[PDB]
With several copies, the nearest count.
Chain A
Amino acid sequence: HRTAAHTHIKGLGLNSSGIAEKQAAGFVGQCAAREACGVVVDLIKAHKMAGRGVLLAGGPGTGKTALALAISQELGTKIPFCPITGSEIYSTEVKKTEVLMENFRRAIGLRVRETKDVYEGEVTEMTPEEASTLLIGLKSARGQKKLRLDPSIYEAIQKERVQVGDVIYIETNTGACKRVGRSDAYATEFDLEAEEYVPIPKGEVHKKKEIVQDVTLHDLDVANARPQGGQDIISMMGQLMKPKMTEITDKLRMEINKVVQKYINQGVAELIPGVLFIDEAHMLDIECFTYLNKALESPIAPIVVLASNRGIATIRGADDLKAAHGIPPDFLQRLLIIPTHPYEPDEIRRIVRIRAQTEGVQLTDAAVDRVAEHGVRISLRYCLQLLAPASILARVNGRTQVDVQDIAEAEELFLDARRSANILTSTGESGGLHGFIS
């Protein structure tokens, strides 16, 4: 349990009728944006979505990404959520219209249920039956058990160095085997052998457990393009033979859709459409808002929550047009735009109290007003970053709770950006030996 910048966000805090209530689940105020994000969460769960775009306006300091983490904890662990910033789309190995499709294919989720039948235990004998099939007795501390092996899983046992009485761990379903060690009954056969002597497991020999587990479609794309991990031994050279990201063509995705729809029609897997949260969308340039306008029109595309804080700025990559939000109006008509208004002075105190009781820092009511004064007069990100140093100035001076004096000391030890700009301009007047170098 360590505090982040969004630890106190638990959920959107809605009613049963989809109406936001003030000071609920960590948020303070911000009604209409939480109502709209609740509608977005219901749209994601409704499974009637093949590409929808949601933009979040509002300047810096307001709660844009807090809404996104509220959505991410409102969906749960089940439905996949991929947060990427705009600046991650640039690479030096692939084009930047292919990393977008890699994020779209990381967004869609594919849930498979398995019943793994694991076999822990000490090998009793290695008897080749036919001349082929090789029986193995797996002795536990509860009883041994015979086991008939396929002639291909035995060539995976045999590659491992399993001889007489090594404890092993056979997966029955997936056919995965690991040699855990040599059993301690055969420990002191010789006296300085070099193995890992482990005791016989004091449980069952046949443990049957079931596991629900997810796979993203991008992992299917990578595992079908290039051999990965298992038998890819020439990758230890590194220079040309490493697993470099390659240009996954449209034909490969068009076939992987066929195969996944085949395994959904058999009732094996389940499909769950995810969320792609692209943050600070002004860093996306015009060679990607062209490609999003195509890639959202697929019948498989996930919902895209874009976040952008800028005003009428210059679209990157094409310097001769200005547009709102850094988003071209060719693309801006698709988006559902949600506003994010600033904070009143009576709605900053509650954020101070919630952020204080998240970090455990308790403080008197005469200091909450001072932190709210710095929140009104300077910024919201700065006033919340004085609750943690002042507690360090509290338990050192023989106190437990934070008073006005510790914050009056921390405002001098920890200057903000505005007073540093005033010192940088006015106090740092002459550019000489002991001056700043503009």
Chain B
Amino acid sequence: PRLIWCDGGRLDKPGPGNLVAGFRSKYLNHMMNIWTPENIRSSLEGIENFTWLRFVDTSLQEAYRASHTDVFARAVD
């Protein structure tokens, strides 16, 4: 039906009725994420978790694009 496939049966389509799917998308993919460059820049200076990021041939933008695309789009990159 058009309820499940379009309106609010999908947990990813952020239509009205699926009021969770906007909030959950933003606060799991851009605010409370450990790969956003703001949440990397504060943890790069010693024993902490992104210590190694200075030495692998990447940058913050390399890591941030690499942690949200697919295996496909990362292969195209």
Contact partner, B14, options A178, A219, A233, Cβ 8 Å: A178
How far, in Å, is B34 (CB) from chain A's closest CB?
Answer: 5
In the complex, whether A176 has a CB less than 8 A from a CB of chain B is yes
With A231-B70, A251-B49 as given contacts, are A116 and B31 in contact (CB-CB < 8 Å)?
Answer: no
* Cβ contacts under 8 Å, B21 to chain A: 176
A254 near B71 with CB under 8 A, answer no
Q: Is the CB of B29 within 8 A of A223?
A: yes
A174 contacts B by Cβ under 8 Å: yes
- Counting chain B residues whose Cβ lies within 8 A of the other chain, the interface size class is 35 or more
Contact B70 A255 (CB under 8 A): no
Q: Are B75 and A233 in contact (CB under 8 A)?
A: yes
| A93-112, CB < 8 A from B | 112
User: Interface range on chain A: under 10, 10 to 19, 20 to 34, or 35 or more?
Assistant: 35 or more
Closest to A229 in B: B12
Which residue, A116, A177, A255, A256, has most C-beta atoms of chain B within 10 A?
A: A255
Decide: B72 and A233 in contact? CB cutoff 8 A. yes
24 A–B pairs (Cβ distance < 8 Å), ordered by A: A116-B22, A174-B23, A176-B21, A176-B25, A180-B15, A211-B19, A215-B24, A215-B28, A223-B29, A224-B34, A230-B25, A230-B29, A231-B69, A232-B70, A233-B70, A233-B72, A234-B70, A235-B70, A237-B72, A240-B71, A255-B43, A256-B34, A259-B34, A263-B31
Using a CB–CB cutoff of 8 Å, the interface residues on chain A facing chain B are 112, 114, 116, 118, 120, 169, 171, 173-178, 180, 211, 213, 215, 219-220, 223-224, 227-237, 240-241, 251-252, 254-256, 258-260, 262-263
Known: A237-B72, A258-B49; 5 extra A-B contacts, CB below 8 A, are A120-B16, A176-B25, A231-B73, A241-B71, A259-B32
